[PDB]
Design a protein around this ligand. Structure first.
Ligand SMILES: C[C@@H]1O[C@H](NC(=O)c2cccc(-c3ccccc3)c2)[C@@H](O)[C@H](O)[C@@H]1O
Ligand SMILES: C[C@@H]1O[C@H](NC(=O)c2cccc(-c3ccccc3)c2)[C@@H](O)[C@H](O)[C@@H]1O
Ligand SMILES: C[C@@H]1O[C@H](NC(=O)c2cccc(-c3ccccc3)c2)[C@@H](O)[C@H](O)[C@@H]1O
Ligand SMILES: C[C@@H]1O[C@H](NC(=O)c2cccc(-c3ccccc3)c2)[C@@H](O)[C@H](O)[C@@H]1O
Ligand SMILES: [Ca+2]
Ligand SMILES: [Ca+2]
Ligand SMILES: [Ca+2]
Ligand SMILES: [Ca+2]
Ligand SMILES: [Ca+2]
Ligand SMILES: [Ca+2]
Ligand SMILES: [Ca+2]
Ligand SMILES: [Ca+2]
Lengths: 114, 114, 114, 114
């Protein structure tokens, strides 16, 4: 199944935050309406926050997370959870290797803000 | 129901990251085995990361998040999600006022690391 | 925080299914747009499926679950999860006693159907 | 990533319940410690319950859901959600065709029971 794609409400601010847990340098690209809107890179085995930014979901509300290591796409896992019918989290994990820890880049999207 | 309490595997590193979305300064306490292990304080209406840390779940695995604003406890909402039976997210929202956005402090716990 | 309230897409068929795990007789009310649309009842400590129904979310999309036992309202916990940005589950647990298992009536809402 | 595999607490009763939403007859196999423990088959386009059963997670706690239609494996999506650190849902959707609704068989695993 497709993973790392989320439909947000249109024209809505959201937070995106990426963490790294791998010997491989992570590249996190965050696409809004199929164009890169934020990019984070880094290498950590201790959950560094390799980036955090506020973006706008724009007219389509389509948000996609892509994770690659030196140009090789990582395998993604994802889901969205809603608390008290108001508070939204879009969650991504990624695997750059063979151990299937799926934490090599971890991306958290949250909305609403403010 | 109790919210903001999570059972992690024992003796396991985890990440905790807090975001703020309120006119009020948020104070987040992260407890391990009922004792505060991290405190983050900050003020943002734009989802700023007010703190991030790596902690160890220790012998009990018990992790609790508490949020206060102007010396008063916020109401919490929480859940845990597991992706591909490997990647864990413990999610907390908090409400310090009357609008029930539950984003006033947002806390994300993730494990495993490395 | 409020629990057991979900916003579905308007005019959308959904499934609602109730499970019982308590010595107390469960009564589960399912409200659509603040009017009772389904009532299920039973008594099981082995997860009996006391009801399952297909309902339509109608113009408002508002669905609320309430649970009572021997005339007393149960405490609710809830969340919504979305898989592959398409498959939706709205989840409720309820507690009628002292043990905080929150399984006394369990309600799962799923959409889309067909 | 692997989907439909869940680690339950050992020696714990759990519920498994399947729904169908497809022109294809669904076959749901539930494996405990890699051995078939339950099988449900049925056909519905209206979310009918095609099976429900109570199983024991046994010494390993390993539970796996597989779905096939006319002997062809469906693609799966899954996650686990925990409410109030007590109430567990292991959720599976499956796709037997081209529309990516992932509801063709829906499988809900819930624990604890009782
Ligand atoms: C420390 C481990 O790092 C692994 N990752 C790698 O070993 C890795 C992956 C891709 C590329 C590279 C690499 C390539 C060129 C130079 C340096 C590192 C390493 C990762 O999958 C494991 O879960 C674990 O966190
Ligand atoms: C900007 C708004 O800020 C609210 N914040 C408050 O209601 C709040 C609650 C307690 C104290 C304060 C505060 C503290 C010092 C100075 C000014 C305000 C704000 C918050 O709940 C809303 O969701 C929104 O983000
Ligand atoms: C078997 C247990 O049942 C409990 N519930 C009760 O014991 C209960 C709740 C409400 C009413 C009654 C009841 C009252 C009068 C006479 C008989 C039963 C029991 C429940 O909370 C526990 O999790 C557990 O499943
Ligand atoms: C009604 C539709 O049914 C589709 N499924 C099929 O049409 C399907 C898939 C596999 C096999 C068969 C089939 C094959 C032989 C005989 C009868 C059914 C149908 C399903 O994917 C769609 O979401 C939708 O619910
Ligand atoms: Ca890895
Ligand atoms: Ca890793
Ligand atoms: Ca608020
Ligand atoms: Ca706020
Ligand atoms: Ca109970
Ligand atoms: Ca019970
Ligand atoms: Ca389908
Ligand atoms: Ca279908």
């Amino acid at each position: 199944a497709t993973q790392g794609v989320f439909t947000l409400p249109a024209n809505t601010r959201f937070g995106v935050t990426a963490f790294a847990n791998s010997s491989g340098t992570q590249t996190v690209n965050v696409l809004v309406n199929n164009e890169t809107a934020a990019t984070f890179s880094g290498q950590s085995t201790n959950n560094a926050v390799i980036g955090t930014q506020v973006l706008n979901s724009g007219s389509s509300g389509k948000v996609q997370v892509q994770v690659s290591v030196n140009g090789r796409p990582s395998d993604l896992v994802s889901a969205q959870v809603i608390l008290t019918n108001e508070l939204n989290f879009a969650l991504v994990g990624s695997e750059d290797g063979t151990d299937n820890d799926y934490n090599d880049a971890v991306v958290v999207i949250n909305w609403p803000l403010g």
